[PDB]
Write a protein that binds this ligand. Structure first.
Ligand SMILES: Cn1c(=O)c2nc(SCCCNC(=S)NCCN3CCOCC3)[nH]c2n(C)c1=O
Length: 165
């Protein structure tokens, strides 16, 4: 239904809000929610763990079946799976693990996956344990995504830092 409310408009197509992405998805019921995944779709913590828990583990079951059939994703790549109760679809996107030496240029390829969908609810990619500077990830998002993206930033201090700049 895509009834996004309370977002700050950064550009014509990028919007941002201090919010829990699971709570947003339950309110809005978007066509697409983006998961910040790893190449094996092991949804162990962070955004991925929270989305999986909200689907009662069904996201993990579907992901495991995807991996058994297709093998792991490429860094910078993605796949569409069901959004279960949270969204129509879930776009699982793999940003680079910058801390482990994966090329940060792949953050551009990661965000390019968003351009296949007219509107997305999404987190900042690579911006937790993967070690990418969230200011940098937001800039790559703005420079790369041309479709409508609604970004949810969980931590208030970080949101305030991103929107001040
Ligand atoms: C509601 N909401 C948020 O909106 C939110 N945004 C963040 S920061 C960036 C997104 C998450 N980090 C990524 S780099 N993980 C790398 C891949 N992982 C996949 C499985 O685990 C191991 C590795 N954290 C958040 N959390 C916890 C949250 O609940």
């Amino acid at each position: 239904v895509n009834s996004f409310s309370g977002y700050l408009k950064l550009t014509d197509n990028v919007y941002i809000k201090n919010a829990d992405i699971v709570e947003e998805a339950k309110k809005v019921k978007p066509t697409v929610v983006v998961n910040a995944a790893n190449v094996y779709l092991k949804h162990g913590g962070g955004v991925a763990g929270a989305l999986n828990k909200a689907t009662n583990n069904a996201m993990q079951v579907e992901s495991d079946d995807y991996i058994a059939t297709n093998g792991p994703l490429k860094v910078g790549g993605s796949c569409v799976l069901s959004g279960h109760n949270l969204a129509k679809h879930c776009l699982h996107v793999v940003g680079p693990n910058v801390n482990k030496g994966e090329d940060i240029q792949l953050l551009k390829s990661a965000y390019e996956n968003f351009n296949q969908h007219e509107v997305l609810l999404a987190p900042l990619l690579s911006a937790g344990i993967f070690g990418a500077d969230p200011i940098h990830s937001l800039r790559v998002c703005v420079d790369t995504v041309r479709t409508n993206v609604y970004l949810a930033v969980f931590d208030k201090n970080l949101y305030d830092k991103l929107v001040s700049s």
